[PDB]
Design a protein around this ligand. Structure first.
Ligand SMILES: Nc1ncnc2c1ncn2[C@@H]1O[C@H](COP(=O)(O)OP(=O)(O)O)[C@@H](O)[C@H]1O
Ligand SMILES: Nc1ncnc2c1ncn2[C@@H]1O[C@H](COP(=O)(O)OP(=O)(O)O)[C@@H](O)[C@H]1O
Lengths: 438, 153
Protein backbone atom coordinates (compact mmCIF):
# COMPACT_ATOMS: atom_id res chain seq x y z
CA UNK A 1 0.00 0.00 0.00
CA UNK A 2 2.77 2.13 -1.41
CA UNK A 3 6.04 0.17 -1.73
CA UNK A 4 7.77 3.50 -1.10
CA UNK A 5 6.30 4.16 2.37
CA UNK A 6 8.62 3.09 5.21
CA UNK A 7 8.71 3.17 9.03
CA UNK A 8 11.55 5.37 10.30
CA UNK A 9 13.67 3.15 12.52
CA UNK A 10 17.04 3.74 14.24
CA UNK A 11 20.38 4.21 12.48
CA UNK A 12 23.34 1.82 12.39
CA UNK A 13 25.44 4.37 10.53
CA UNK A 14 26.00 7.62 12.48
CA UNK A 15 26.63 9.60 9.28
CA UNK A 16 24.12 12.38 8.49
CA UNK A 17 24.01 11.69 4.74
CA UNK A 18 23.11 8.01 4.71
CA UNK A 19 19.92 6.05 5.25
CA UNK A 20 19.66 2.25 5.17
CA UNK A 21 17.08 -0.04 3.58
CA UNK A 22 17.09 -3.80 2.98
CA UNK A 23 18.28 -5.25 -0.33
CA UNK A 24 14.89 -6.72 -1.21
CA UNK A 25 13.50 -3.20 -0.73
CA UNK A 26 16.24 -1.66 -2.84
CA UNK A 27 15.22 -4.10 -5.60
CA UNK A 28 11.48 -3.51 -5.32
CA UNK A 29 12.41 0.18 -5.51
CA UNK A 30 15.21 -0.31 -8.02
CA UNK A 31 17.82 1.56 -5.94
CA UNK A 32 21.58 1.08 -5.88
CA UNK A 33 24.42 0.92 -3.38
CA UNK A 34 25.07 4.66 -3.41
CA UNK A 35 22.04 6.25 -5.02
CA UNK A 36 21.02 9.67 -3.79
CA UNK A 37 17.40 9.59 -2.63
CA UNK A 38 14.60 12.08 -1.99
CA UNK A 39 12.95 11.63 1.43
CA UNK A 40 9.53 13.11 2.25
CA UNK A 41 8.05 13.33 5.73
CA UNK A 42 5.87 15.63 7.84
CA UNK A 43 5.01 19.32 7.76
CA UNK A 44 5.61 19.07 4.02
CA UNK A 45 9.36 18.47 4.54
CA UNK A 46 12.15 16.82 2.57
CA UNK A 47 15.72 15.60 2.73
CA UNK A 48 18.29 14.16 0.35
CA UNK A 49 20.48 11.23 1.32
CA UNK A 50 22.65 8.37 0.13
CA UNK A 51 21.05 4.94 0.47
CA UNK A 52 23.06 1.88 1.57
CA UNK A 53 22.02 -1.73 2.24
CA UNK A 54 21.48 -3.18 5.73
CA UNK A 55 20.94 -6.93 6.22
CA UNK A 56 19.51 -6.31 9.73
CA UNK A 57 16.93 -3.82 8.48
CA UNK A 58 13.44 -5.03 7.60
CA UNK A 59 11.76 -4.58 4.21
CA UNK A 60 9.25 -2.10 5.65
CA UNK A 61 11.56 -0.04 7.89
CA UNK A 62 14.22 2.58 7.07
CA UNK A 63 17.20 3.37 9.26
CA UNK A 64 18.01 7.07 9.67
CA UNK A 65 19.92 9.13 12.21
CA UNK A 66 18.43 11.88 14.37
CA UNK A 67 19.71 14.64 12.09
CA UNK A 68 17.71 13.48 9.05
CA UNK A 69 14.81 12.40 11.24
CA UNK A 70 14.58 16.03 12.41
CA UNK A 71 15.09 17.58 9.01
CA UNK A 72 12.01 15.55 8.10
CA UNK A 73 10.03 16.36 11.26
CA UNK A 74 9.37 12.67 11.97
CA UNK A 75 9.94 10.51 15.05
CA UNK A 76 10.88 6.86 15.13
CA UNK A 77 7.84 4.81 14.18
CA UNK A 78 6.58 7.48 11.81
CA UNK A 79 6.35 6.88 8.07
CA UNK A 80 8.10 8.62 5.21
CA UNK A 81 8.16 8.03 1.48
CA UNK A 82 11.34 7.42 -0.48
CA UNK A 83 11.93 8.28 -4.13
CA UNK A 84 15.11 8.21 -6.25
CA UNK A 85 16.82 11.52 -7.13
CA UNK A 86 19.42 10.94 -9.95
CA UNK A 87 18.85 14.40 -11.42
CA UNK A 88 20.87 15.92 -8.54
CA UNK A 89 24.03 17.82 -9.49
CA UNK A 90 27.26 19.40 -8.27
CA UNK A 91 26.81 22.55 -6.24
CA UNK A 92 27.93 26.03 -7.21
CA UNK A 93 27.51 28.15 -4.09
CA UNK A 94 26.28 27.23 -0.60
CA UNK A 95 25.34 29.53 2.26
CA UNK A 96 25.23 28.12 5.77
CA UNK A 97 25.14 29.67 9.20
CA UNK A 98 25.69 28.25 12.66
CA UNK A 99 22.80 28.04 15.12
CA UNK A 100 23.62 30.53 17.89
CA UNK A 101 23.17 28.24 20.87
CA UNK A 102 25.75 25.81 19.48
CA UNK A 103 28.70 28.17 19.11
CA UNK A 104 28.41 30.22 22.28
CA UNK A 105 31.61 29.75 24.20
CA UNK A 106 33.92 29.48 21.20
CA UNK A 107 35.69 31.83 18.82
CA UNK A 108 37.72 31.02 15.72
CA UNK A 109 37.30 29.81 12.16
CA UNK A 110 34.47 27.28 12.09
CA UNK A 111 34.64 26.85 8.33
CA UNK A 112 38.21 25.57 8.72
CA UNK A 113 37.50 23.66 11.94
CA UNK A 114 34.03 22.33 10.99
CA UNK A 115 32.66 22.81 7.44
CA UNK A 116 35.93 22.07 5.60
CA UNK A 117 36.54 18.72 7.35
CA UNK A 118 32.87 17.70 7.33
CA UNK A 119 32.39 18.10 3.57
CA UNK A 120 35.90 17.46 2.25
CA UNK A 121 35.62 14.99 -0.73
CA UNK A 122 32.54 13.25 0.85
CA UNK A 123 30.09 14.58 -1.73
CA UNK A 124 27.34 15.06 0.81
CA UNK A 125 23.94 15.80 -0.75
CA UNK A 126 22.12 18.70 0.87
CA UNK A 127 18.68 20.20 0.47
CA UNK A 128 18.02 23.83 1.39
CA UNK A 129 16.67 24.30 4.92
CA UNK A 130 18.64 21.26 6.13
CA UNK A 131 20.20 21.46 9.59
CA UNK A 132 23.26 19.29 10.10
CA UNK A 133 25.62 18.54 12.95
CA UNK A 134 29.43 18.55 13.00
CA UNK A 135 31.54 17.34 15.95
CA UNK A 136 34.93 18.67 17.09
CA UNK A 137 36.88 20.81 19.54
CA UNK A 138 35.04 18.81 22.22
CA UNK A 139 31.55 19.94 21.25
CA UNK A 140 29.09 19.82 18.36
CA UNK A 141 28.09 22.75 16.13
CA UNK A 142 24.74 22.94 14.37
CA UNK A 143 24.56 24.45 10.88
CA UNK A 144 21.56 25.38 8.77
CA UNK A 145 21.64 25.47 4.96
CA UNK A 146 20.26 28.95 4.19
CA UNK A 147 20.47 28.50 0.43
CA UNK A 148 22.16 26.33 -2.20
CA UNK A 149 22.98 27.48 -5.72
CA UNK A 150 21.53 24.57 -7.60
CA UNK A 151 18.34 24.99 -5.56
CA UNK A 152 16.74 23.42 -3.64
CA UNK A 153 19.13 20.49 -3.46
CA UNK A 154 22.66 19.66 -4.60
CA UNK A 155 25.86 17.81 -3.81
CA UNK A 156 28.77 19.52 -2.04
CA UNK A 157 31.77 18.73 -4.27
CA UNK A 158 35.44 19.75 -4.05
CA UNK A 159 34.52 22.75 -6.20
CA UNK A 160 31.41 23.89 -4.37
CA UNK A 161 32.02 27.34 -2.88
CA UNK A 162 30.84 27.63 0.74
CA UNK A 163 29.73 30.98 2.18
CA UNK A 164 29.48 31.34 5.95
CA UNK A 165 28.61 35.05 6.46
CA UNK A 166 29.35 35.74 10.12
CA UNK A 167 25.89 35.93 11.74
CA UNK A 168 24.54 32.97 13.78
CA UNK A 169 20.83 32.45 13.24
CA UNK A 170 18.55 31.88 16.23
CA UNK A 171 16.93 28.48 16.65
CA UNK A 172 13.27 28.01 15.80
CA UNK A 173 11.03 26.46 18.43
CA UNK A 174 10.14 23.44 16.31
CA UNK A 175 13.83 22.78 15.62
CA UNK A 176 15.00 20.48 18.41
CA UNK A 177 18.70 20.79 19.17
CA UNK A 178 20.72 17.72 18.36
CA UNK A 179 22.52 18.40 21.62
CA UNK A 180 19.47 16.80 23.20
CA UNK A 181 19.31 13.40 24.88
CA UNK A 182 18.44 10.61 22.47
CA UNK A 183 18.31 6.82 22.31
CA UNK A 184 21.61 7.29 20.53
CA UNK A 185 23.10 8.75 23.70
CA UNK A 186 22.29 5.59 25.64
CA UNK A 187 24.44 2.45 25.57
CA UNK A 188 24.29 -0.85 27.41
CA UNK A 189 20.53 -0.86 27.90
CA UNK A 190 18.75 -2.42 24.94
CA UNK A 191 16.18 -4.89 26.17
CA UNK A 192 15.16 -2.35 28.81
CA UNK A 193 14.73 0.34 26.19
CA UNK A 194 12.85 -2.09 23.98
CA UNK A 195 10.39 -2.63 26.83
CA UNK A 196 10.01 1.00 27.87
CA UNK A 197 9.63 1.99 24.21
CA UNK A 198 6.73 -0.29 23.54
CA UNK A 199 5.22 0.60 26.88
CA UNK A 200 4.87 4.31 26.02
CA UNK A 201 4.51 3.89 22.25
CA UNK A 202 0.70 4.02 22.07
CA UNK A 203 -0.32 6.29 24.95
CA UNK A 204 2.33 8.91 24.13
CA UNK A 205 2.15 8.67 20.33
CA UNK A 206 -1.47 7.67 19.73
CA UNK A 207 -3.59 9.28 22.54
CA UNK A 208 -6.88 9.22 20.62
CA UNK A 209 -6.59 5.46 20.59
CA UNK A 210 -7.37 5.56 24.29
CA UNK A 211 -10.17 8.06 23.82
CA UNK A 212 -11.82 5.50 21.53
CA UNK A 213 -10.67 2.41 23.38
CA UNK A 214 -11.41 0.96 26.80
CA UNK A 215 -8.11 -0.74 27.62
CA UNK A 216 -5.65 0.55 30.23
CA UNK A 217 -2.06 1.46 29.25
CA UNK A 218 0.74 1.06 31.81
CA UNK A 219 0.58 4.01 34.22
CA UNK A 220 3.79 4.07 36.19
CA UNK A 221 7.19 2.81 35.17
CA UNK A 222 9.68 2.18 37.93
CA UNK A 223 13.42 2.11 37.17
CA UNK A 224 15.77 -0.05 39.27
CA UNK A 225 19.54 0.14 39.33
CA UNK A 226 22.53 1.63 41.14
CA UNK A 227 23.47 5.32 40.78
CA UNK A 228 24.78 6.59 37.44
CA UNK A 229 23.04 3.88 35.45
CA UNK A 230 21.30 6.36 33.16
CA UNK A 231 17.79 6.09 34.53
CA UNK A 232 17.26 9.87 34.18
CA UNK A 233 18.95 9.92 30.81
CA UNK A 234 16.71 7.04 29.68
CA UNK A 235 13.53 8.76 30.79
CA UNK A 236 14.54 12.09 29.26
CA UNK A 237 15.30 10.42 25.92
CA UNK A 238 12.07 8.46 25.64
CA UNK A 239 10.32 11.78 26.20
CA UNK A 240 12.30 13.80 23.63
CA UNK A 241 12.37 10.87 21.21
CA UNK A 242 8.56 10.66 21.42
CA UNK A 243 7.75 14.38 21.23
CA UNK A 244 6.40 13.93 24.75
CA UNK A 245 6.31 16.77 27.28
CA UNK A 246 8.80 16.25 30.10
CA UNK A 247 8.75 17.34 33.72
CA UNK A 248 11.44 16.36 36.20
CA UNK A 249 10.79 16.06 39.91
CA UNK A 250 13.66 15.48 42.29
CA UNK A 251 13.17 14.08 45.78
CA UNK A 252 15.90 15.99 47.62
CA UNK A 253 14.55 19.05 45.85
CA UNK A 254 10.93 18.49 46.92
CA UNK A 255 11.94 17.33 50.39
CA UNK A 256 13.73 20.61 51.12
CA UNK A 257 10.64 22.80 50.79
CA UNK A 258 8.90 23.77 54.02
CA UNK A 259 6.16 21.44 55.32
CA UNK A 260 3.12 21.84 53.07
CA UNK A 261 5.09 23.96 50.60
CA UNK A 262 6.52 20.59 49.59
CA UNK A 263 3.23 18.91 48.69
CA UNK A 264 1.92 22.03 46.99
CA UNK A 265 4.86 21.49 44.60
CA UNK A 266 4.16 17.83 43.91
CA UNK A 267 0.60 18.75 42.92
CA UNK A 268 1.65 21.80 40.91
CA UNK A 269 4.05 19.44 39.08
CA UNK A 270 1.56 16.70 38.27
CA UNK A 271 -0.97 19.38 37.41
CA UNK A 272 1.40 20.86 34.84
CA UNK A 273 2.42 17.57 33.24
CA UNK A 274 -1.25 17.06 32.45
CA UNK A 275 -1.67 20.51 30.93
CA UNK A 276 0.93 19.52 28.31
CA UNK A 277 0.15 15.84 27.88
CA UNK A 278 1.07 13.57 26.36
CA UNK A 279 3.76 13.99 29.01
CA UNK A 280 6.26 12.06 31.12
CA UNK A 281 6.73 12.86 34.78
CA UNK A 282 10.06 11.62 36.07
CA UNK A 283 10.48 11.52 39.84
CA UNK A 284 14.21 11.32 40.37
CA UNK A 285 15.32 9.97 43.71
CA UNK A 286 11.83 8.68 44.59
CA UNK A 287 13.00 6.91 47.78
CA UNK A 288 13.82 10.45 48.94
CA UNK A 289 10.05 10.89 49.07
CA UNK A 290 8.60 7.41 49.59
CA UNK A 291 10.43 5.00 51.94
CA UNK A 292 7.57 4.27 54.46
CA UNK A 293 8.44 0.55 55.00
CA UNK A 294 10.10 0.91 58.41
CA UNK A 295 12.14 4.07 57.73
CA UNK A 296 9.27 6.58 57.47
CA UNK A 297 8.68 8.92 60.43
CA UNK A 298 7.17 12.40 60.36
CA UNK A 299 3.77 14.11 60.36
CA UNK A 300 5.08 15.63 57.13
CA UNK A 301 7.21 12.79 55.80
CA UNK A 302 4.09 10.59 55.81
CA UNK A 303 1.83 13.43 54.66
CA UNK A 304 4.00 13.65 51.50
CA UNK A 305 4.08 10.00 50.47
CA UNK A 306 0.31 9.85 50.91
CA UNK A 307 0.22 12.95 48.75
CA UNK A 308 2.22 11.13 46.05
CA UNK A 309 -0.01 8.09 46.33
CA UNK A 310 -3.11 10.28 45.90
CA UNK A 311 -1.57 12.11 42.95
CA UNK A 312 -0.71 8.76 41.33
CA UNK A 313 -4.24 7.33 41.60
CA UNK A 314 -5.42 10.69 40.31
CA UNK A 315 -4.02 9.97 36.85
CA UNK A 316 -5.97 8.37 33.97
CA UNK A 317 -7.49 10.81 31.43
CA UNK A 318 -7.40 12.05 27.80
CA UNK A 319 -3.96 12.31 26.14
CA UNK A 320 -2.19 10.17 28.67
CA UNK A 321 0.74 11.19 30.85
CA UNK A 322 3.02 8.49 32.21
CA UNK A 323 4.97 8.61 35.43
CA UNK A 324 8.53 7.31 35.62
CA UNK A 325 10.44 7.03 38.89
CA UNK A 326 13.92 5.94 39.83
CA UNK A 327 15.47 4.21 42.80
CA UNK A 328 18.25 1.74 43.56
CA UNK A 329 15.89 -1.13 44.38
CA UNK A 330 12.38 -2.30 45.42
CA UNK A 331 13.16 -2.44 49.13
CA UNK A 332 13.84 1.32 49.16
CA UNK A 333 10.36 2.28 47.95
CA UNK A 334 7.04 2.40 49.80
CA UNK A 335 5.14 -0.83 48.93
CA UNK A 336 2.09 1.36 48.34
CA UNK A 337 3.65 2.75 45.18
CA UNK A 338 3.46 -0.73 43.64
CA UNK A 339 -0.30 -1.16 44.13
CA UNK A 340 -1.24 -1.82 40.52
CA UNK A 341 -2.76 1.40 39.14
CA UNK A 342 0.37 3.22 40.32
CA UNK A 343 3.91 2.04 39.52
CA UNK A 344 2.72 -1.27 38.05
CA UNK A 345 5.60 -1.68 35.64
CA UNK A 346 9.24 -2.27 36.61
CA UNK A 347 12.52 -2.21 34.69
CA UNK A 348 15.91 -3.15 36.13
CA UNK A 349 18.81 -1.31 34.52
CA UNK A 350 21.82 -3.36 35.49
CA UNK A 351 25.45 -2.46 35.04
CA UNK A 352 26.73 -2.57 31.47
CA UNK A 353 28.57 -5.62 30.18
CA UNK A 354 31.86 -5.41 28.30
CA UNK A 355 30.11 -4.50 25.05
CA UNK A 356 27.90 -2.06 26.94
CA UNK A 357 30.87 -0.10 28.20
CA UNK A 358 32.50 -0.04 24.79
CA UNK A 359 29.24 1.44 23.55
CA UNK A 360 28.99 3.99 26.39
CA UNK A 361 32.64 4.90 25.89
CA UNK A 362 32.02 5.74 22.25
CA UNK A 363 29.03 7.91 23.04
CA UNK A 364 31.07 10.04 25.48
CA UNK A 365 34.06 10.54 23.18
CA UNK A 366 32.18 11.41 20.00
CA UNK A 367 32.95 15.09 20.33
CA UNK A 368 36.67 14.68 21.05
CA UNK A 369 39.72 14.00 18.92
CA UNK A 370 41.18 10.61 19.93
CA UNK A 371 44.72 9.71 18.95
CA UNK A 372 45.19 6.50 16.95
CA UNK A 373 46.69 4.77 19.99
CA UNK A 374 43.45 5.10 21.91
CA UNK A 375 42.06 1.61 22.41
CA UNK A 376 38.50 1.99 23.80
CA UNK A 377 37.97 -1.77 23.65
CA UNK A 378 40.89 -2.12 26.08
CA UNK A 379 39.45 0.66 28.23
CA UNK A 380 36.10 -1.08 28.02
CA UNK A 381 37.69 -4.43 28.86
CA UNK A 382 39.34 -3.26 32.09
CA UNK A 383 36.40 -1.35 33.65
CA UNK A 384 34.49 -4.37 34.91
CA UNK A 385 31.93 -3.03 37.39
CA UNK A 386 31.66 0.53 36.06
CA UNK A 387 28.39 2.24 35.17
CA UNK A 388 27.81 5.02 32.67
CA UNK A 389 28.38 7.79 35.20
CA UNK A 390 31.79 6.19 35.79
CA UNK A 391 32.75 5.86 32.14
CA UNK A 392 31.65 9.45 31.46
CA UNK A 393 33.78 10.65 34.35
CA UNK A 394 36.64 8.57 32.97
CA UNK A 395 36.37 10.31 29.58
CA UNK A 396 36.00 13.75 31.11
CA UNK A 397 39.12 13.22 33.20
CA UNK A 398 41.22 11.86 30.32
CA UNK A 399 40.35 14.92 28.26
CA UNK A 400 41.00 17.41 31.04
CA UNK A 401 44.32 15.64 31.66
CA UNK A 402 45.12 15.97 27.97
CA UNK A 403 44.18 19.65 28.11
CA UNK A 404 46.52 20.17 31.05
CA UNK A 405 49.61 18.72 29.42
CA UNK A 406 49.26 20.02 25.90
CA UNK A 407 47.34 23.26 25.50
CA UNK A 408 47.84 24.14 29.20
CA UNK A 409 51.64 24.31 29.18
CA UNK A 410 51.82 26.09 25.81
CA UNK A 411 49.26 28.29 27.59
CA UNK A 412 46.37 29.71 25.56
CA UNK A 413 43.63 29.70 28.20
CA UNK A 414 41.55 32.22 30.18
CA UNK A 415 40.52 34.55 27.33
CA UNK A 416 38.01 33.24 24.76
CA UNK A 417 39.10 29.73 23.69
CA UNK A 418 39.93 29.33 19.98
CA UNK A 419 38.23 26.48 18.09
CA UNK A 420 41.30 25.57 16.02
CA UNK A 421 43.22 25.01 19.26
CA UNK A 422 40.62 22.81 20.91
CA UNK A 423 40.22 21.03 17.60
CA UNK A 424 43.88 20.08 17.17
CA UNK A 425 44.30 18.74 20.70
CA UNK A 426 43.93 14.94 20.83
CA UNK A 427 43.33 12.67 23.81
CA UNK A 428 45.85 9.83 23.78
CA UNK A 429 45.70 6.31 25.18
CA UNK A 430 48.26 7.70 27.54
CA UNK A 431 45.66 10.21 28.73
CA UNK A 432 43.11 7.46 29.40
CA UNK A 433 45.83 5.53 31.14
CA UNK A 434 46.35 8.42 33.49
CA UNK A 435 42.62 8.57 34.15
CA UNK A 436 42.25 4.82 34.74
CA UNK A 437 45.14 5.00 37.22
CA UNK A 438 43.73 7.62 39.60
CA UNK B 1 60.96 39.01 58.07
CA UNK B 2 60.31 36.54 60.92
CA UNK B 3 61.04 37.02 64.63
CA UNK B 4 59.70 37.80 68.09
CA UNK B 5 57.18 35.03 67.37
CA UNK B 6 55.55 36.72 64.39
CA UNK B 7 56.33 37.99 60.90
CA UNK B 8 56.58 41.65 59.83
CA UNK B 9 55.90 42.80 56.29
CA UNK B 10 58.00 45.62 54.82
CA UNK B 11 57.57 47.57 51.61
CA UNK B 12 60.48 49.21 49.77
CA UNK B 13 59.23 52.80 49.30
CA UNK B 14 62.34 53.92 47.43
CA UNK B 15 65.96 52.89 46.81
CA UNK B 16 68.77 55.32 46.03
CA UNK B 17 70.19 53.56 43.04
CA UNK B 18 66.66 53.35 41.61
CA UNK B 19 64.73 51.26 40.82
CA UNK B 20 66.85 48.34 41.97
CA UNK B 21 70.01 47.78 44.00
CA UNK B 22 71.82 45.52 46.44
CA UNK B 23 71.68 46.13 50.19
CA UNK B 24 75.35 46.09 51.25
CA UNK B 25 77.03 46.64 54.63
CA UNK B 26 77.24 50.32 53.69
CA UNK B 27 73.71 50.85 52.46
CA UNK B 28 71.93 53.32 54.73
CA UNK B 29 68.42 52.19 55.70
CA UNK B 30 65.70 54.73 56.54
CA UNK B 31 62.59 53.53 58.36
CA UNK B 32 60.61 56.76 59.02
CA UNK B 33 58.07 55.82 61.69
CA UNK B 34 54.77 55.59 59.77
CA UNK B 35 53.30 52.18 58.83
CA UNK B 36 51.69 52.21 55.40
CA UNK B 37 48.27 50.65 54.90
CA UNK B 38 47.99 47.51 52.80
CA UNK B 39 46.64 47.72 49.27
CA UNK B 40 43.79 45.40 48.33
CA UNK B 41 45.76 43.60 45.63
CA UNK B 42 48.63 42.99 48.06
CA UNK B 43 47.88 39.67 49.74
CA UNK B 44 49.36 39.35 53.21
CA UNK B 45 52.06 36.74 53.51
CA UNK B 46 50.44 35.88 56.82
CA UNK B 47 47.93 34.01 54.68
CA UNK B 48 47.56 30.24 54.39
CA UNK B 49 49.70 28.77 51.63
CA UNK B 50 50.85 25.40 50.31
CA UNK B 51 53.99 26.30 52.21
CA UNK B 52 52.02 26.21 55.46
CA UNK B 53 51.00 22.60 54.85
CA UNK B 54 53.23 19.62 55.62
CA UNK B 55 52.72 15.87 55.44
CA UNK B 56 50.16 15.96 52.65
CA UNK B 57 51.81 15.90 49.24
CA UNK B 58 50.10 13.35 47.05
CA UNK B 59 46.76 14.65 48.32
CA UNK B 60 47.71 18.20 47.46
CA UNK B 61 49.00 17.05 44.09
CA UNK B 62 45.57 15.58 43.38
CA UNK B 63 43.49 18.48 44.68
CA UNK B 64 45.76 20.91 42.82
CA UNK B 65 45.23 19.34 39.46
CA UNK B 66 41.56 18.89 40.20
CA UNK B 67 40.92 22.65 40.59
CA UNK B 68 43.69 23.84 38.25
CA UNK B 69 41.57 24.33 35.12
CA UNK B 70 38.12 25.29 36.43
CA UNK B 71 39.52 27.80 38.95
CA UNK B 72 42.37 29.15 36.80
CA UNK B 73 41.00 28.78 33.27
CA UNK B 74 37.16 29.25 33.47
CA UNK B 75 36.72 30.24 29.81
CA UNK B 76 38.01 26.81 28.91
CA UNK B 77 34.72 25.45 30.19
CA UNK B 78 32.71 28.13 28.44
CA UNK B 79 34.23 26.87 25.17
CA UNK B 80 34.41 23.21 26.12
CA UNK B 81 31.80 20.55 26.82
CA UNK B 82 33.61 18.40 29.40
CA UNK B 83 32.69 18.32 33.10
CA UNK B 84 35.26 19.27 35.77
CA UNK B 85 35.08 17.64 39.22
CA UNK B 86 32.30 19.34 41.18
CA UNK B 87 32.65 18.34 44.80
CA UNK B 88 35.79 17.35 46.65
CA UNK B 89 35.34 15.45 49.88
CA UNK B 90 38.11 15.40 52.50
CA UNK B 91 38.53 12.39 54.82
CA UNK B 92 40.63 12.24 57.95
CA UNK B 93 40.57 12.63 61.73
CA UNK B 94 40.32 16.05 63.41
CA UNK B 95 43.24 18.48 63.15
CA UNK B 96 44.52 16.97 59.93
CA UNK B 97 44.52 20.30 58.10
CA UNK B 98 41.51 19.76 55.88
CA UNK B 99 40.35 23.38 56.40
CA UNK B 100 43.88 24.68 56.07
CA UNK B 101 44.27 22.69 52.83
CA UNK B 102 41.06 24.06 51.34
CA UNK B 103 41.84 27.63 52.37
CA UNK B 104 45.31 27.42 50.79
CA UNK B 105 44.20 26.00 47.45
CA UNK B 106 41.78 28.93 47.31
CA UNK B 107 44.29 31.67 48.21
CA UNK B 108 47.02 30.00 46.17
CA UNK B 109 44.71 30.02 43.13
CA UNK B 110 43.29 33.53 43.49
CA UNK B 111 39.96 31.79 44.05
CA UNK B 112 37.17 33.33 46.12
CA UNK B 113 36.64 31.51 49.40
CA UNK B 114 33.55 31.02 51.53
CA UNK B 115 33.53 28.90 54.66
CA UNK B 116 30.42 27.16 55.93
CA UNK B 117 30.47 25.43 59.28
CA UNK B 118 27.95 22.76 60.24
CA UNK B 119 27.58 23.53 63.95
CA UNK B 120 27.25 27.14 62.88
CA UNK B 121 24.48 26.47 60.33
CA UNK B 122 22.79 23.91 62.56
CA UNK B 123 22.32 26.45 65.35
CA UNK B 124 20.13 28.81 63.35
CA UNK B 125 16.38 28.51 63.87
CA UNK B 126 14.48 26.07 61.62
CA UNK B 127 14.29 27.60 58.14
CA UNK B 128 16.70 30.38 59.11
CA UNK B 129 19.27 27.63 58.75
CA UNK B 130 18.53 26.72 55.13
CA UNK B 131 18.14 30.36 54.14
CA UNK B 132 21.82 30.62 55.14
CA UNK B 133 23.01 27.63 53.13
CA UNK B 134 21.41 29.16 50.02
CA UNK B 135 22.65 32.67 50.76
CA UNK B 136 26.13 31.09 51.07
CA UNK B 137 26.09 29.13 47.83
CA UNK B 138 24.48 32.12 46.15
CA UNK B 139 27.38 34.33 47.20
CA UNK B 140 30.15 31.92 46.23
CA UNK B 141 28.75 32.06 42.71
CA UNK B 142 28.65 35.85 42.63
CA UNK B 143 32.44 35.82 43.11
CA UNK B 144 33.39 32.72 41.16
CA UNK B 145 35.74 31.21 40.45
CA UNK B 146 35.18 30.29 44.10
CA UNK B 147 35.60 27.49 46.61
CA UNK B 148 32.88 26.67 49.09
CA UNK B 149 34.20 24.75 52.06
CA UNK B 150 31.62 23.09 54.28
CA UNK B 151 33.46 22.40 57.51
CA UNK B 152 31.97 19.71 59.70
CA UNK B 153 29.65 18.45 56.94
N1 LIG C 1 23.67 3.72 29.50
C1 LIG C 1 24.36 4.91 29.47
N2 LIG C 1 24.81 5.40 28.27
C2 LIG C 1 25.47 6.56 28.24
N3 LIG C 1 25.76 7.35 29.29
C3 LIG C 1 25.31 6.86 30.47
C4 LIG C 1 24.61 5.70 30.65
N4 LIG C 1 24.33 5.54 32.00
C5 LIG C 1 24.82 6.57 32.56
N5 LIG C 1 25.42 7.41 31.71
C6 LIG C 1 26.10 8.73 32.06
O1 LIG C 1 26.01 8.92 33.49
C7 LIG C 1 25.25 10.17 33.81
C8 LIG C 1 24.36 9.24 34.62
O2 LIG C 1 23.37 9.96 35.31
P1 LIG C 1 21.83 9.78 35.14
O3 LIG C 1 21.42 9.65 33.74
O4 LIG C 1 21.20 10.84 35.96
O5 LIG C 1 21.65 8.32 35.80
P2 LIG C 1 20.96 7.80 37.11
O6 LIG C 1 19.60 8.42 37.14
O7 LIG C 1 21.05 6.32 37.28
O8 LIG C 1 21.91 8.54 38.24
C9 LIG C 1 24.43 10.43 32.58
O9 LIG C 1 24.12 11.83 32.45
C10 LIG C 1 25.37 9.94 31.41
O10 LIG C 1 26.32 10.99 31.05
N1 LIG D 1 49.44 19.21 57.37
C1 LIG D 1 49.52 20.26 58.26
N2 LIG D 1 50.54 21.16 58.17
C2 LIG D 1 50.61 22.17 59.03
N3 LIG D 1 49.75 22.44 60.03
C3 LIG D 1 48.75 21.54 60.12
C4 LIG D 1 48.54 20.47 59.30
N4 LIG D 1 47.40 19.80 59.71
C5 LIG D 1 46.96 20.46 60.70
N5 LIG D 1 47.70 21.52 61.00
C6 LIG D 1 47.45 22.53 62.12
O1 LIG D 1 46.26 22.12 62.83
C7 LIG D 1 45.21 23.19 62.75
C8 LIG D 1 44.35 22.07 62.17
O2 LIG D 1 43.03 22.52 61.94
P1 LIG D 1 42.32 22.55 60.55
O3 LIG D 1 43.18 23.04 59.47
O4 LIG D 1 41.02 23.22 60.77
O5 LIG D 1 42.14 20.97 60.30
P2 LIG D 1 40.90 20.00 60.26
O6 LIG D 1 39.90 20.67 59.36
O7 LIG D 1 41.25 18.59 59.98
O8 LIG D 1 40.39 20.14 61.82
C9 LIG D 1 45.59 23.99 61.55
O9 LIG D 1 45.09 25.34 61.65
C10 LIG D 1 47.16 23.95 61.56
O10 LIG D 1 47.68 24.97 62.46
Amino acid sequence: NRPNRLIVDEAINEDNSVVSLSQPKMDELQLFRGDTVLLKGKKRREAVCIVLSDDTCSDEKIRMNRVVRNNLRVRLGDVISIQPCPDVKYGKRIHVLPIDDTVEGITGNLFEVYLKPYFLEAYRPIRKGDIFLVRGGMRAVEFKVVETDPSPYCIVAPDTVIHCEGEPIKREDEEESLNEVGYDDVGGCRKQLAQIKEMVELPLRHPALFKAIGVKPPRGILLYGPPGTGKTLIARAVANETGAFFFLINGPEIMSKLAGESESNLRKAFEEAEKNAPAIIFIDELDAIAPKREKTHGEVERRIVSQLLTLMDGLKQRAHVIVMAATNRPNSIDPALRRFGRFDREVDIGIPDATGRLEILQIHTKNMKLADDVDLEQVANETHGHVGADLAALCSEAALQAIRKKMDLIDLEDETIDAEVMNSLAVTMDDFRWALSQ
